Amino acid sequence: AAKDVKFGNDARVKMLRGVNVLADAVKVTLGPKGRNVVLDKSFGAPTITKDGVSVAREIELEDKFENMGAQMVKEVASKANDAAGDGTTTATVLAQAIITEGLKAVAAGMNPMDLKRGIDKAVTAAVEELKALSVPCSDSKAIAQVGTISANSDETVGKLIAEAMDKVGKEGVITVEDGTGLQDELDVVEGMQFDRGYLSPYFINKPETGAVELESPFILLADKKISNIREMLPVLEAVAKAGKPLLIIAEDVEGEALATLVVNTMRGIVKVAAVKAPGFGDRRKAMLQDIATLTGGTVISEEIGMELEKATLEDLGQAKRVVINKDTTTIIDGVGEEAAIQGRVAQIRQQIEEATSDYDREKLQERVAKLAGGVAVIKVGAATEVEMKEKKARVEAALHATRAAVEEGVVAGGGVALIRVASKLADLRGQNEDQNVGIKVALRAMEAPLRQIVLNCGEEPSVVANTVKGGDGNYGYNAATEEYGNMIDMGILDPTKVTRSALQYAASVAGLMITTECMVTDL
Amino acid sequence: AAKDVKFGNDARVKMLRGVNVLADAVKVTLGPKGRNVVLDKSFGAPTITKDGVSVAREIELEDKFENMGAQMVKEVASKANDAAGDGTTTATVLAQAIITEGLKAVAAGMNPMDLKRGIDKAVTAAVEELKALSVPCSDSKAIAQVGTISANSDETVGKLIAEAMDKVGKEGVITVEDGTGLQDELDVVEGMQFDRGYLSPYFINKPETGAVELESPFILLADKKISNIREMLPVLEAVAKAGKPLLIIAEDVEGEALATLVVNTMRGIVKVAAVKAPGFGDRRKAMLQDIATLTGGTVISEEIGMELEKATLEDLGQAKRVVINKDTTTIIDGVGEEAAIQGRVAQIRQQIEEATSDYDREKLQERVAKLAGGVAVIKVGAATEVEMKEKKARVEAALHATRAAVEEGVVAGGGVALIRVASKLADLRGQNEDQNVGIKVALRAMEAPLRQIVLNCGEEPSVVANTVKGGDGNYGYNAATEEYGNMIDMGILDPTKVTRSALQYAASVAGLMITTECMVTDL
Amino acid sequence: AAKDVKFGNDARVKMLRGVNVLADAVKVTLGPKGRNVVLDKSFGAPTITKDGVSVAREIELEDKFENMGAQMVKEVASKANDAAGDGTTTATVLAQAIITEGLKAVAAGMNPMDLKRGIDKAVTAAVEELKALSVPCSDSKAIAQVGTISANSDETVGKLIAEAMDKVGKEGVITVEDGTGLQDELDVVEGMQFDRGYLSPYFINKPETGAVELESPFILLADKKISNIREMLPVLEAVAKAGKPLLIIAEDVEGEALATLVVNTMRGIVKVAAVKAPGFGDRRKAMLQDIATLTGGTVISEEIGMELEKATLEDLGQAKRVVINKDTTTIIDGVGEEAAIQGRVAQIRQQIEEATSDYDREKLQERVAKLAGGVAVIKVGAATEVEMKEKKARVEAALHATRAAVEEGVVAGGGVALIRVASKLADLRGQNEDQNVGIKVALRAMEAPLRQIVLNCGEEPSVVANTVKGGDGNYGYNAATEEYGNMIDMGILDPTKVTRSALQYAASVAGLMITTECMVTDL
Ligand SMILES: Nc1ncnc2c1ncn2[C@@H]1O[C@H](COP(=O)(O)OP(=O)(O)OP(=O)(O)O)[C@@H](O)[C@H]1O
Ligand SMILES: Nc1ncnc2c1ncn2[C@@H]1O[C@H](COP(=O)(O)OP(=O)(O)OP(=O)(O)O)[C@@H](O)[C@H]1O
Ligand SMILES: Nc1ncnc2c1ncn2[C@@H]1O[C@H](COP(=O)(O)OP(=O)(O)OP(=O)(O)O)[C@@H](O)[C@H]1O
Ligand SMILES: [Mg+2]
Ligand SMILES: [Mg+2]
Ligand SMILES: [Mg+2]
Numbered sequence A, B, C: 001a002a003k004d005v006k007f008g009n010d011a012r013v014k015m016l017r018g019v020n021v022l023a024d025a026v027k028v029t030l031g032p033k034g035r036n037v038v039l040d041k042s043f044g045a046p047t048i049t050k051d052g053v054s055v056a057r058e059i060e061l062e063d064k065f066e067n068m069g070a071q072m073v074k075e076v077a078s079k080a081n082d083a084a085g086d087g088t089t090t091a092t093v094l095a096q097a098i099i100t101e102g103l104k105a106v107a108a109g110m111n112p113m114d115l116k117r118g119i120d121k122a123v124t125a126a127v128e129e130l131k132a133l134s135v136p137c138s139d140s141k142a143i144a145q146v147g148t149i150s151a152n153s154d155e156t157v158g159k160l161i162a163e164a165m166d167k168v169g170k171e172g173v174i175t176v177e178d179g180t181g182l183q184d185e186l187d188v189v190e191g192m193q194f195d196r197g198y199l200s201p202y203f204i205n206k207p208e209t210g211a212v213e214l215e216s217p218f219i220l221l222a223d224k225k226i227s228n229i230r231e232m233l234p235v236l237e238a239v240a241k242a243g244k245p246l247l248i249i250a251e252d253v254e255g256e257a258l259a260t261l262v263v264n265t266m267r268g269i270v271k272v273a274a275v276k277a278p279g280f281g282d283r284r285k286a287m288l289q290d291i292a293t294l295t296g297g298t299v300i301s302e303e304i305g306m307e308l309e310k311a312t313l314e315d316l317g318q319a320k321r322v323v324i325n326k327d328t329t330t331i332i333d334g335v336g337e338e339a340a341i342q343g344r345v346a347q348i349r350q351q352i353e354e355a356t357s358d359y360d361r362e363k364l365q366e367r368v369a370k371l372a373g374g375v376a377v378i379k380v381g382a383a384t385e386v387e388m389k390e391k392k393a394r395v396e397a398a399l400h401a402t403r404a405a406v407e408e409g410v411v412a413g414g415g416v417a418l419i420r421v422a423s424k425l426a427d428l429r430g431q432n433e434d435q436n437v438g439i440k441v442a443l444r445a446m447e448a449p450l451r452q453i454v455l456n457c458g459e460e461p462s463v464v465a466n467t468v469k470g471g472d473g474n475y476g477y478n479a480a481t482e483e484y485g486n487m488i489d490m491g492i493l494d495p496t497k498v499t500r501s502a503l504q505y506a507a508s509v510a511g512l513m514i515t516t517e518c519m520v521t522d523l
Helices: A009-029 A052-058 A064-084 A088-108 A112-133 A140-151 A155-168 A229-241 A255-265 A281-295 A338-354 A358-372 A385-408 A416-427 A433-457 A461-470 A496-514 B009-029 B052-058 B064-084 B088-108 B112-133 B140-151 B155-168 B229-241 B255-265 B281-295 B338-354 B358-372 B385-408 B416-427 B433-457 B461-470 B496-514 C009-029 C052-058 C064-084 C088-108 C112-133 C140-151 C155-168 C229-241 C255-265 C281-295 C338-354 C358-372 C385-408 C416-427 C433-457 C461-470 C496-514
Strands: A003-007 A174-178 A185-189 A212-215 A218-222 A246-250 A272-276 A321-324 A329-331 A375-380 A410-412 A476-478 A483-485 A493-495 A518-522 B003-007 B174-178 B185-189 B212-215 B218-222 B246-250 B272-276 B321-324 B329-331 B375-380 B410-412 B476-478 B483-485 B493-495 B518-522 C003-007 C174-178 C185-189 C212-215 C218-222 C246-250 C272-276 C321-324 C329-331 C375-380 C410-412 C476-478 C483-485 C493-495 C518-522
Touching (some): A009 A052, A009 A088, A009 A518, A088 A433, A088 A496, A112 A496, A229 A246, A229 A255, A375 A385, A410 A416, A416 A496, A433 A461, A461 A476, B003 B009, B009 B088, B009 B518, B088 B433, B088 B496, B112 B433, B112 B496, B140 B155, B174 B385, B229 B246, B416 B461, B433 B496, B461 B476, B493 B496, C009 C052, C009 C518, C064 C088, C112 C410, C140 C493, C155 C174, C155 C185, C385 C493, C385 C496, C416 C461, C416 C496, C476 C483
Parallel strands (some): C246 C272
Antiparallel strands (some): A212 A321, A321 A329, B212 B321, B321 B329, C185 C375, C321 C329
């Protein structure tokens, strides 16, 4: 229809305003100081949102332009959020600062391209500085602190993460489940996880994560790849009597032949999942055997000459629940046999010793390791179910961040790294003045989030920022202490990766936002 | 219903205004200096457009008249864009200048017909001058520069094009694929391409290009033409078990008999493609054999007495993907057998040597050449998928332009050719004054785009244009240098063809636009 | 519902205004001087119309009354246009002048009936004068000029017509086809045309012309008339395998029996055409044989005892395309056999010589003549497809006009005949004064179109008209020359028929329009 066209700033302004609104809520929330926001819902009782991301998620802008601008930030932020596990807000905060300055520059009329380049250049420099700055992750006490940061002053989460982490081991994977009751429960789980993808996203379950969880899944394992439906079918027929959800393990399915027929021909209404059998070769078979024992189901192979058709439901094992993600597919708990599982482990363990070769040992050890498979399950209790879900989500985020953080190693929190890097960054100059300003802008952007925390403190961020900058080495302000001390000594460290991730995304967002000469919209 | 009728200028004005709006955005963008524009979308997050064409594409005018006028320019521009591969903006820019002047002339009330004729005459003269002006394409370094022009200061694209071009060879075809990852990958592809059309546009796939790509296509080759469905059918039945998309190679299908029955009788729901077998006669058979080996499928011929019905899926080969365009049909990668492919090539190669005759040698050599078939595949990485798509499109455009440019040979860029020609053109007179003015107008139009670049520079285009005109030979202004130097020496050259194409189209557009005595529209 | 009633002038005025609007656009366009008009379209990009008819066609009036009035003129004009092939505008121009005067007379309140009678009387007189005035058509150079007139200064069309005409021969029919490419191609076609009607308009194809064109038609010839479906059916069954469109040649079909069953019983969805076999008696058979040879199909006759059912598709010939019009049915190109066709021609030719009788000779010669059948095909190229269509239409119109013109013979163009006749006409008096005025009006009307051309010239038509009238013999003004010279000598001649046709229609229109005492419309 008729279009309303605006040029120049008009495009920017809408985005800017939208960004600010979203940013403002997020910024306040960010930092242990800040607090959450509330949203209405037509669907049901209104939703109250905490966590910076959630607040942003909740916030929608009536104005299309503003909303769209807001959306852009959010999407980037989420992406950073996923990878970092934390720092969603930080990216948002950074982006807002960058955008505003960039917009002003746009007002300046300096070509934004240089600025973007300068910003990117600055970002790269900052990243390098950060990496150098980053140091190894500290001990569990630090870990708890790391957890707390993700916690946003959720002491329990950090404690839980640390506790879970300790028992499982940092390396060991920890899984989160909804709490049985208000009190959290930490249980080591009997079961194994193997890294296998889901064949198709179609398989991917309802939840947003896209990990598929099956309730009481049935496990059919074929050492042989499941070439075609027909072999499968007689298994399926038993499955019809079944209907507890079916998980299928096959060495491989050729996508075209199976998928084409299956998808088009077959509705595939019945719940099914497919995963490639872990490992390859004998090891794969061995892994299958291990899985089979754990499942308590049996595996059918051509070599055995057992027929899939022949195999009944009984052959198929059952799992209490299975979760699958693209990276990995896990079975939370195969029913298994306690004796059987143990026996297999011992047998494998014996094998590990038996094999002279390291390689043989490794495969066996890996196999046993999986079978022993101490997976941590963490239950989060809550006063209410809703709370539990909220808590659980937070916990999960924290866990990821913590795990990443430990490996990456700690960097000073409080945006100390950001401020510190900026000073170094400032010296660096862009190719051209326009770039230079952008570079400066980026530096300014980095500084801001420190200020925000200070603002939450109510201390004047200027002094703090100045002081922070002045201090060499790792210098920072601890909100809780409200005292100056080494970040490391304080033990409050934000993950390198999260910081880096957020910054990069934020920078990207800002750059993208800046360059629009013109907008068109409908009237 | 009731009509709102306007006479004379009223018709023109709407078009003119519409043209200007579209043109303005395009003009600024054009040239390495310029920048892109943004568009909203109801469908999803708003679309931000760069590249002159895209900006134009994005821009829609609320006013029907204006929009229509804008559309007219765009359509012509695109046509020029396709052929030239570049210069979409240039044509638009040229058109706008011409149109405005023509409109003014219309205001003058001079009969536009003469003007159009004069313009056409001028265009022809200019074209001739350009052709003479044009010189052979320069080396790869120039090529990169050529690439950059298409790049619109996309250094990477030019580099990629040059790099791809070098390895493949200029003559060798280069294909672009989406990047696997952010980093670009250049891989020579194993596979052959043969120039065959698609039997029907119906076959033509979803994408706008209309080239059809099949995922994991199955290749059925019959040396014999596939007369009727019935012979095909048993192949199809196997195909039913199949469903990875089927590509059919047949010597010929008589359109009426097969098509009539097939289309009407048969939904043709299942994905299928048909291509004529390459070559004719023994050579065709030989080509088929080469294809068959590459595919790894087998070919069935009456002479063999193999039956299509008899032939199973296995006989049909598979391709990783196939792309078909009207001009040519290619298989990106037949699974083939590495040994088999090599062996065939050697055998053919031996044949080439064996044949005394040049003709025999040529056919064989062509066959081997296809089999060796170093096709370049270029993967474009991107920060985001969206970016990659955008980049890829740009890359593709650049590649076409570069290829065309090299063969055509370089002409001075910067609209140097255009300005230069105009001066010569000016001397030429139209038959009548009205024609004369039109001729002058065309000349003026040519000059303008040089100015636009200058304007982007911010230098006063008048001086530059004057200076450029003054210089004899190839004289031009390099935006980047902002120094006067030989265009050739500078090595920044716009393709002759692109320039010529754009000019002709623009002229055509302008002429068309000019002549409307009256408009009618609904109220 | 409620009606808005107007009496007297109110009815007229709407029509008059509508007429003027349509007329004005047309008048300007008419004459080589004039230019075309543009129209919008919701459907797609707006349609730009040239050619007087098209402009009129495009122009629609919002007002119902005006529109209706406009429509009336157009419809008559088109009718004249078809017959004349040219002079669509002229009729319109004439009508407008007549109508206005008549309306004024209506204002006068003189009974329009007399005026109409007077006008008719004047027209008749004028016609007689014109006929006497008309002279034989001139040579090809004139023909080109004739072509140009239809051309409306389309030099190419005239040239093409002349060129086509020369090769084909004036007598020989010329057919127009869309150009293969921009360059026109003139090819003599191998094929025969026979004058046969289409049995039913139902058969009549989609296009407005109503001529039916079949793509790759199949030709079934029965010497015997195709009495019933049943005999046909087995042919049809083969046809089902077919589906390239089927053309049927039968001696006769009794309408009721076949049609009733066929239409009602049978959807007749499958494309089919029926034509009566050319000629009757042995000659008809002979013609069929000639057709059959040309088609390459075979004919089945009862005498032969061949069965239609028995006859397969193979027996049926195929044609590249067939065009059928009510007057005649032609096959553009039967596949035929080159040798076969030639042989038949020779055989017939021998027969022609062989037959002593003129009658026998004539039939044979006609048969051979058809087989030799040099039909001219003219391809019109265009810059764009749209242009080509437009050009083609113009070309076709020109061809008809030219052919008619040549036979009729030339009359002075420029409305010279019209002006000349009027003077003579003026002397003639109507029965009564009211008639007299009408007669004068008609005379005035004739004069006007000369003026319009002059107006386009910008010369004052009064002087020209006066001068033209003054000159005895053929005196006229040549727009291009802008010099006075003999029309014949100038060689610019408008066809007698076209002029006569247009005048008569215009007069009819004017008369019809004039007499409405009252109008009623809805509110
Ligand atoms: N006591 C503290 N002293 C200094 N800064 C602190 C302290 N506790 C936390 N912070 C800082 O506050 C930020 C963590 O808060 P938060 O997790 O809300 O930010 P975020 O991760 O960007 O937002 P979200 O978690 O909603 O994505 C980090 O920069 C962290 O170092
Ligand atoms: N350094 C330079 N000096 C002079 N002119 C330059 C320079 N770099 C590019 N140009 C000119 O700018 C134009 C190329 O820009 P662009 O590709 O945007 O124009 P376009 O092809 O008409 O637009 P589009 O590519 O959007 O169709 C050419 O005329 C080219 O010669
Ligand atoms: N050089 C000329 N000198 C005099 N009159 C001319 C000349 N060329 C063409 N004409 C006249 O102009 C008229 C032909 O133009 P045109 O074909 O547009 O009129 P039309 O046939 O009535 O309109 P249309 O072709 O749209 O129906 C004729 O009367 C013809 O004699
Ligand atoms: Mg956080
Ligand atoms: Mg370009
Ligand atoms: Mg005409």
